[PDB]
């Protein structure tokens, strides 16, 4: 019944502290060490440190050059992981390891914690449609979605006809860009024969912003 | 620090067939115990990091037998003797005899299917972005295999260059195609200098580029 839950999904503005909970159970807490581990988005897993509940003692990679600390708490089986002095290339997910004696390196890992630095201001998206037209030309197979643009921070959910229609549909990964902002589209294939039948909206969810809209995607 | 090396970076799969996964260290991971500190981790999509194979050739409880660890003083490899759909995300190499911890670049596997062209569709800004200053154009290559594609822009047969940015979905689970977006940015103003905004696809699926385009202001 070994389980690590940490702590939510965490914003920070550049040259700022995060500090990250990992909540351990089902073990003797004290005598098994804790490893923290990174993975920037799209990019490999890296070894940022680990403590010792049992002692305190702990071991850094050097490249952090000390803008890790590691932390544990025994009286609560929580271990903490603080990072200084945060840059955009800080920007990942963390997570914490548990080791178990005789060679079993890293083999419980938590769910993850999302960290992402920048200095952009929580904002609402736009919601533009991407109508659906053709005409002549041949191939006849519709496509249509919604540009959902200019939003901060990540996640954004989209879904078509309140979640009736999932068959076809794609939403590509957000994209950041020179703007502190993030920006994406989801599309959806249909039958051209039937875009005067079926009434076609793309819900956007925006939780960070309190922001939902429902845009319609009509023809022309 | 002992650098771990993975080859290949991308290894698509064919379901049933065999499946191999390399992995070299600058250093010799094996100790005086006889003990080699080579470990093999899994990333499913979506999911956290699993141990997968704990010092080279030791299987975690659970992982099907399919799966193996062999190894030789510095080349180490993983082995499916039959690949699944369910083995598919990112394997990580990793050692632990030394400080700090260092793992490999990942090899991520995906499923190996009949090439398939992409549908190709091209959308203009929105008239309500227009009156906003700006016009995103939109081009998308829908279901298509392999992932590998050349899109590239050409406004009034001119060629584009950083104009634009792309994004690809992850490998469907039901058909195992992809899905790419390339938009274009360009003012409201820099976009009535032009008419015809063009996206040219090349794909394994193609005998030749194909191209879908639009004038400006008129459907």
């Known amino acids: 019944q070994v389980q690590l839950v940490q702590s939510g999904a965490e914003v920070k503005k550049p040259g700022s502290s995060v500090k990250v909970s990992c909540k351990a159970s089902?073990?003797?807490?004290?005598?098994?060490?804790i490893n923290w581990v990174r993975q920037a988005p799209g990019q490999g897993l890296e070894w940022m440190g680990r403590i010792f509940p049992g002692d305190g003692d702990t071991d850094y990679n050097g490249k952090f050059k000390g803008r890790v600390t590691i932390t544990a708490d025994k009286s609560t089986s929580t271990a903490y992981m603080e990072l200084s002095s945060l840059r955009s290339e800080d920007t990942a997910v963390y997570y914490c390891?548990?080791?178990?004696?005789?060679?079993?390196?890293?083999?419980?890992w938590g769910q993850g914690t999302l960290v992402t630095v920048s200095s952009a201001s929580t904002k609402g998206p736009s919601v533009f449609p991407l109508a659906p037209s053709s005409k002549s030309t041949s191939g006849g197979t519709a496509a249509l979605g919604c540009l959902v643009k200019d939003y901060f921070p990540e996640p954004v959910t989209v879904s078509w006809n309140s979640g009736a229609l999932t068959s076809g549909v794609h939403t590509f990964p957000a994209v950041l860009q020179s703007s502190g902002l993030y920006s994406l589209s989801s599309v959806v294939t249909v039958p051209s024969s039937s875009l005067g039948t079926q009434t076609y909206i793309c819900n956007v969810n925006h939780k960070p912003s309190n922001t939902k809209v429902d845009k319609k995607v009509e023809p022309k | 620090d002992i650098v771990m090396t993975q080859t290949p970076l991308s290894l698509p799969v064919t379901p049933g067939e065999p499946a191999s996964i390399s992995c070299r260290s600058s250093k010799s991971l094996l100790h005086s115990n006889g003990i080699t500190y080579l470990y093999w981790y899994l990333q499913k999509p979506g999911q956290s990091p699993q141990l997968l194979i704990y010092?080279?050739?030791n299987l975690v409880s659970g992982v099907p037998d399919r799966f193996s660890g062999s190894g030789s003083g510095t080349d180490f490899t993983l082995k499916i003797s039959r690949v699944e759909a369910e083995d598919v995300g990112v394997y990580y190499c990793?050692?632990?005899?030394?400080?700090?911890?260092?793992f490999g670049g990942g090899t991520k596997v995906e499923i190996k299917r009949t090439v398939a062209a992409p549908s190709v569709f091209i959308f203009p800004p929105s008239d309500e972005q227009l009156k906003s200053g700006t016009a995103s154009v939109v081009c998308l290559l829908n279901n298509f295999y392999p992932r590998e594609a050349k899109v590239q822009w050409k406004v009034d047969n001119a060629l584009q260059s950083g104009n634009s940015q792309e994004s690809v979905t992850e490998q469907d689970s039901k058909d195992s195609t992809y899905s790419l977006s390339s938009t274009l940015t360009l003012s409201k103003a820099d976009y009535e200098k032009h008419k015809v905004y063009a996206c040219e696809v090349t794909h394994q699926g193609l005998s030749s580029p194909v191209t879908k385009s639009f004038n400006r202001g008129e459907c």
């Open positions: 390891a548990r080791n178990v004696f005789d060679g079993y390196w890293l083999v419980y």
């Open positions: 089902g073990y003797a807490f004290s005598y098994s060490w």
């Open positions: 990793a050692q632990n005899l030394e400080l700090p911890y260092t």
């Open positions: 010092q080279m050739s």
